Amino acid sequence: KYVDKIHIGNYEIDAWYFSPFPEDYGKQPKLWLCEYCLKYMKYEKSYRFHLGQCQWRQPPGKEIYRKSNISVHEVDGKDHKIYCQNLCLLAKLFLDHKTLYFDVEPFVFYILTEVDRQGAHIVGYFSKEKESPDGNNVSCIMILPPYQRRGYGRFLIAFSYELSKLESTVGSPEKPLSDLGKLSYRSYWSWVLLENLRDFTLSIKDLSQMTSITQNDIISTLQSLNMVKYWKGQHVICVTPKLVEEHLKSAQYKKPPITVDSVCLKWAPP
Numbered sequence: 001k002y003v004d005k006i007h008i009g010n011y012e013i014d015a016w017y018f019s020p021f022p023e024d025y026g027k028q029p030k031l032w033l034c035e036y037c038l039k040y041m042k043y044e045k046s047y048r049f050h051l052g053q054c055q056w057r058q059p060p061g062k063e064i065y066r067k068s069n070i071s072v073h074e075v076d077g078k079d080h081k082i083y084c085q086n087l088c089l090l091a092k093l094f095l096d097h098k099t100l101y102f103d104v105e106p107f108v109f110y111i112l113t114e115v116d117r118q119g120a121h122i123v124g125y126f127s128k129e130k131e132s133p134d135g136n137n138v139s140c141i142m143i144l145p146p147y148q149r150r151g152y153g154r155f156l157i158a159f160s161y162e163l164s165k166l167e168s169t170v171g172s173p174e175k176p177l178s179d180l181g182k183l184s185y186r187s188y189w190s191w192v193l194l195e196n197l198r199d200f201t202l203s204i205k206d207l208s209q210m211t212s213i214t215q216n217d218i219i220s221t222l223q224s225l226n227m228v229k230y231w232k233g234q235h236v237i238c239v240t241p242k243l244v245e246e247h248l249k250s251a252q253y254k255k256p257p258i259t260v261d262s263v264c265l266k267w268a269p270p
């Protein structure tokens with residue numbers, strides 16, 4: 001009765017949550033998704049027909065980042081409404097808290113793809129309100145299940161902050177975050193703050209301007225590392241160069257990242 005399984009690319013993926021595709025679409029065993037234009041279909045037969053006809057081989061919009069075979073496309077919800085709606089319905093299969101699927105005009109979508117000779121294969125995305133009253137640099141962020149915990153979420157988080165830096169703004173993900181989202185942000189913040197502390201020294205305000213991480217997220221991260229003291233109503237960094245190195249040598253920071261090469265990012269504040 002609900003969509004419980006999708007086929008996209010060469011992946012079949014079980015659903016995690018309800019997503020409000022039309023009811024007739026939920027009645028089948030599977031939904032079949034074109035991995036390039038994200039059209040969803042009811043039957044393997046219409047999917048195969050679509051595959052031989054569809055001419056798209058990458059997301060719409062502008063490629064604002066390209067390094068080697070890693071690419072990010074910026075898609076304006078107002079310019080590519082159907083695609084962005086398709087994207088939000090797919091994302092809702094794996095996000096508990098996302099609530100906006102059809103009114104996509106106030107959002108811009110950053111699509112992460114992995115390119116090979118056949119085309120640019122979607123890995124995940126994050127959305128961003130064009131005008132955030134509460135200073136969120138991410139509204140929702142989603143990595144497709146078979147790509148999770150493989151460095152792609154870390155890339156997208158870093159990417160969202162590289163945009164904030166170009167905007168001369170601090171930003172924060174819209175809350176609530178998933179379990180994995182909490183872990184991923186905490187670990188991204190810890191790495192970024194510890195590398196900055198090793199490289200220089202710095203106030204909490206200094207770190208915020210260098211990283212675009214909000215002062216609250218910095219404070220809560222430093223508290224979980226136990227590197228902040230409290231003095232007459234103010235949080236003050238309290239860290240020795242050696243303790244920073246003992247943290248950075250820890251095994252969790254051992255996997256080599258997909259980095260965001262600032263030189264490969266083509267984007268100006270809107």
Ligand SMILES: O=C(NNS(=O)(=O)c1ccccc1F)c1cccc(I)c1
Nearest residue numbers: 143148149150151152153154181184187
């Ligand atoms: O895939 C995930 N996160 N995994 S990670 O890219 O390996 C990673 C490693 C270190 C630090 C941060 C990271 F995100 C993942 C999946 C869905 C939503 C989100 I939000 C993240």
Ligand SMILES: [Zn+2]
Nearest residue numbers: 034036037054
């Ligand atoms: Zn298509």
